[PDB]
From a paper:
FtfL is a key enzyme in C1 metabolism pathway. It catalyzes the synthesis of formyltetrahydrofolic acid from formic acid and tetrahydrofolic acid. Formyltetrahydrofolic acid is then converted through two reactions to 5,10-methylene tetrahydrofolic acid, a metabolite for biosynthesis of pyrimidines and amino acids. PaFtfL exhibits a tetramer in all three crystal structures, consistent with other reported FtfL crystal structures.
To further investigate the structural mechanism of FtfL inhibition by BBR, we determined the crystal structures of PaFtfL apo enzyme, PaFtfL complexed with its substrate ATP, as well as PaFtfL complexed with BBR at 2.0 Å, 2.3 Å, and 2.6 Å resolutions, respectively. Protomers A/B and protomers C/D form two stable dimers with an interface area of 2100 Å2, and the two dimers assemble into a tetramer with an additional interface area of 620 Å2. Each protomer comprises its own solvent-exposed active site close to the protomer interface. Structural comparison reveals that PaFtfL adopts essentially the same overall fold for each of the protomers and exhibits an identical active site as in reported crystal structures of FtfL from other bacterial species, indicative its conserved catalytic mechanism.
Residue numbers in the entry:
A (entry chain C): 3 to 558
B (entry chain A): 4 to 558
Amino acid sequence: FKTDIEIAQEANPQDIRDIAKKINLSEDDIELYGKYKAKIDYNVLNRTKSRAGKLILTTAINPTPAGEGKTTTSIGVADALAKLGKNVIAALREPSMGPVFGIKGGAAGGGYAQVVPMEDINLHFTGDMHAIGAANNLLAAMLDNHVYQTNSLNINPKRITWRRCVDMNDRQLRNVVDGLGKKVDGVTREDGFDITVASEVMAAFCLSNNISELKENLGNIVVAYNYSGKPVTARDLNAHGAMAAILKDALKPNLVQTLEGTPAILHGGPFANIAHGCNSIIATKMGMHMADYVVTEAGFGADLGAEKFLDIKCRKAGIRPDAVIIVATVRALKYNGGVAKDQLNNENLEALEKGLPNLLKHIENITQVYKIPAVVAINRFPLDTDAELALVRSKCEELGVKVALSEVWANGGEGGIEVANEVLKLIEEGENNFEYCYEEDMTIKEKLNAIATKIYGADGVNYTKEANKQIAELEELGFGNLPVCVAKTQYSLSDDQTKLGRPTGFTIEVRQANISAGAGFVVVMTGEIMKMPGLPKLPAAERIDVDENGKISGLF
Amino acid sequence: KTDIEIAQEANPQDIRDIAKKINLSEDDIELYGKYKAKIDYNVLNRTKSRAGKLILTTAINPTPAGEGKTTTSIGVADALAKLGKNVIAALREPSMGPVFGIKGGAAGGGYAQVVPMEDINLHFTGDMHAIGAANNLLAAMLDNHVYQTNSLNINPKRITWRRCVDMNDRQLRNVVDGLGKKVDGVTREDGFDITVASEVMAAFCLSNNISELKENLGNIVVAYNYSGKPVTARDLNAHGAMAAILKDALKPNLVQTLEGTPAILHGGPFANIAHGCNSIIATKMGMHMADYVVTEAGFGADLGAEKFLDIKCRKAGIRPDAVIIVATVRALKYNGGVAKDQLNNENLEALEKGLPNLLKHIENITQVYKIPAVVAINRFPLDTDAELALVRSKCEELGVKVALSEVWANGGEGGIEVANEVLKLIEEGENNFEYCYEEDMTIKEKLNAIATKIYGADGVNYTKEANKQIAELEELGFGNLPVCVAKTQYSLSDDQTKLGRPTGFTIEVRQANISAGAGFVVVMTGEIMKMPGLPKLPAAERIDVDENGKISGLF
């Protein structure tokens, strides 16, 4: 048994200039950040011909307390396709540095399906998070400056929605009052900080097809409302040009590699509840432009990440997945059947059949609602009996979807050959009549009803009085044509985190709706959301140390 | 031509070729593009030093118009390269915040610049972001400790640590945080500084290595307990994580001048509440990789040079071999009573009235610190030969040559006269370097030595709160540390209107604070703005990006 850090330290990563050569990138097309990291110039998309690569989307069932192994499968499949002689790129998200100092930080993946360098990725990496935060906080500085100087835009201070950010888990900054002191020290008002990955800049950063669309999206950001009730934008403050300049280099995707030398692109990392939870469009487009196959993923389960990948990202990017990988484990399905977190290692065919409807619902959503070829990837554990694996296979064969066993955590690309070959079969043969869940012409409530009934399995959607008032205001201002991003719990298809398996007779309770005009969707809240996490009693930072030679210990 | 046209028309060499000039291998540097690199600080442990000489560039008290101190440092470095010397220019990295308020600007000016100018003004190599992340992590765990248990018995009204952001945001000067539910923290007053004002930056620049950085960060006093005792970052188990955040940032950044001379940019603290010099690691790396190092200190010789010598050189164990004092005829005539609009006209009477300012800085460098000095005059076209002869005559009486500098328009060729006099001062080797005070003196004795010897004051006056704060610092054991005086830079006194060389004045001290991480006591003679504000029409409104990602409007 080797830890993930031991494995990353014993692997021999190639010079990134050689990794770039695998995808036909020259020295003038990349900017080095050391010998193991590089940023890819996004202008290469204009002076090279596209390869029209295939898009493979990795999703999973609803998260369980001790699983969440979507990324290990994405990397293993990418390494597997490389073993089979394919030109493949893995497209993933960059994690937030903040949580590393609270709860222990981890690898991009795990076991022998990792991305290297592990230490840099968890920390500053190539500086993307700092640039997003600087753009977010510049807009806030220019907003408060306008109100302080003249307020010729007639901004109402009690209606300012823009919040500052920091890449730290600091509960102290959730609710603040600033602008205190002398008359030269600003205008007093209530304010607050989010974690940087929660900023709307991050969502617009990840949903821009190029630098021109980024500057336009940043300008459309609604930061406040005037006394007449009309939105005030970053463009009204003449700030989006400076924000785009701060993000000029950050928008270049970051090129790294897996343990086996497979090219990997890490770019962006928004939330999967108040945002779409996918990596940037630029990274996915660049992969499809430079490679024949692209393996990407979406956060949480297929009811949240895959739904937002298809109904938000793919719509704005003009792309369509050719195959979908649905990751699940026998332990996770038995958890949906009533087994506690301590009894999962024992064989239980009865609870496996009670939790299996969860996997079956995600299969029906991908294959019958969106009409995309799918394959179930089971991360096999040693104590998984042949009767348990045969039951999951039989119930999935009834829906026309194969079940491939995955062992990428211990064997790397060799553990994903069975999944990769089934994906290649789904791409060559098998139909793809990709359909969205809803259409843009529908109203906000019609789109919410389409998601809850088709995807979640609910009978309908209920709204609070505040929700009905906010939604109607959005319709009057012209935001009813945009997609909706539902912020609900990930542990269940419903909004109740205890309804495991496949709930039926339930309804969705909507309590808040806000506009993210930069990214181009409406955030609909079905509960309370923590946009700024807190530090525990004993933060992981207390164990982090540096020796006399500059070597970091205690990160993991 | 503007500074951008000169920087855009220049052909910068690949940074790997610049590294070869200073005997750096490929494994000794980390590339940030082909024009920037970070130097592994571990090279100082596996290679032998060249024992390079240290050249300090300072100037007279700043004037509201001319500011060519950095331009002279770069021009002289290029001049020494012309003479066949192995030279490195060591300078500071500017703050990104002000770029969005007023203009962004060149590292230098004219034909004495450092390239790439766009990256230096913006994210550069990410050092500023790392300084801010460490500052804000310590603040997060400080508030977290009080929220969880407060077993250290921290008094919230006595928390001195402030958060930071690299933006000119006046809104964050005075805040109240910890509001809301019981899970949202402990309510208290707080505030933000600009990142370069953080104490992390001063300790970052005053650490000889990564081990000293982690120890200095641990000594940072963030608050006081109810018993009046200091609470440190080490008490919070925070300095290990802070040093990790700064592991790569502590590596000096390698760039180049317009003429290919190697240049190192690292650190940039304030020159009033801090020492206003670049990092010790950068200066040590320069002396380790080159035979001559040209560095500078912010503001005039009464502030930057005093803190470079009495703080930086003390903690680093180095001593400058020569000092360059930069001045202009317009600046000296400004100290003589001429307004900002009448400076282009000849005025030999006002030139003699403002010259005592330059003469005072010469006496401080040569007679108090006993360092060879040379005056570099950035010559303007309307400077008459009679004006240049008067400045020369008054300086020859003090035993200091006057060399004319034209590096702004001609580059290294304009600084050959300055460079040759520096080498002449160096080839003698006589080192009688003395500090202004000694560590065993008390805080009040150290302030009196600075005010009388350097500033020219009769003495130092203190308010009752200043006497109370200083006495508290003495009880806690901080009286053995150097002092960093935070006063106006436009005058030798604390009154910004007393130009020239004031005589009958006294220094008024109103507050004293401890920066135990950096290792000095900050003494203010007035109010200091640690968070600047945006103007009515910020330069950010002119910044734009085209369809290919080219930035316009930065300068």
